[PDB]
Amino acid sequence: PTVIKVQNMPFTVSIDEILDFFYGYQVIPGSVCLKYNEKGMPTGEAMVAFESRDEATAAVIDLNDRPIGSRKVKLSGPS
Amino acid sequence: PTVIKVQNMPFTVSIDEILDFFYGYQVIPGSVCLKYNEKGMPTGEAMVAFESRDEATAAVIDLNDRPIGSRKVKLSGP
């Protein structure tokens, strides 16, 4: 299972919108975690996982810069 | 950049409460991320990142079974 990072999401994003964004890509549905700063507010960042390293890589290639709402999401490959 | 998982926290928890739990360890700023299940609901679980693997390892060894709220938390990884 390889985890990628998602950044620049709008602050109103929902788990469903994240799952929809990766529609067609086999993201594991209960793997999403959303980051929040020290003041308890969402940072626009998330970690999401895929069943294989090859699927994480393909999502990162094909979906980097696609939108979620009005923002182009930034994806960073597995580490 | 080494993360551990935290489980069994109360479902309503603030980042503030989590950072207190880790007071003294070097939690990477902004790396606390609350895990949501398939239904998109809170779960009392989170990923937390530390600057070094040795830091993560100590956190897990020194803080396992300590509480957040009235629940004893389970730490694992990295």
CB nearest A40 (choices: B16, B29, B40): B16
Exposed / middle / buried, residue B12 (Cβ in 10 Å: 0-12, 13-18, 19+): exposed
**Whether A79 and B1 lie within 8 Å, measured CB to CB:** yes
B61 to chain A, closest Cα gap in Å: 24
Which CATH number does the domain housing residue A46 bear?
Answer: 3.30.70.330
Q: A with B: how many residue pairs have Cβ under 8 Å apart? A: 48
CA A78 – CA A10 distance, rounded (Å)? 22
Domain ranges, residue A65: 1-79
Sign of torsion, CA B58 B64 B67 B68?
positive
* Closest residue by Cα to residue B15 from A43, A1, A50: A43
Burial of B2 (0-12, 13-18, 19+ CB in 10 A): middle
The total number of structural domains that make up chain B? 1
Adjacent-strand bridge partners of A7 = A74
Q: To 10 degrees, the CA torsion angle through A19, A23, A29, A32?
A: -40
CA of A52: how far to CAs of A12, A79, B45, in Å? Answer: 29, 13, 23
For chain A, the first-to-last Cα distance in angstroms comes to 11
Please report the resolution in angstroms: 2.0
What secondary structure, in 3-state letters, does B7-68 show?
A: ECCCCCCCHHHHHHHCCCCCECCCCCEEEECCCCCEEEEEEEEECCHHHHHHHHHHHCCCEE
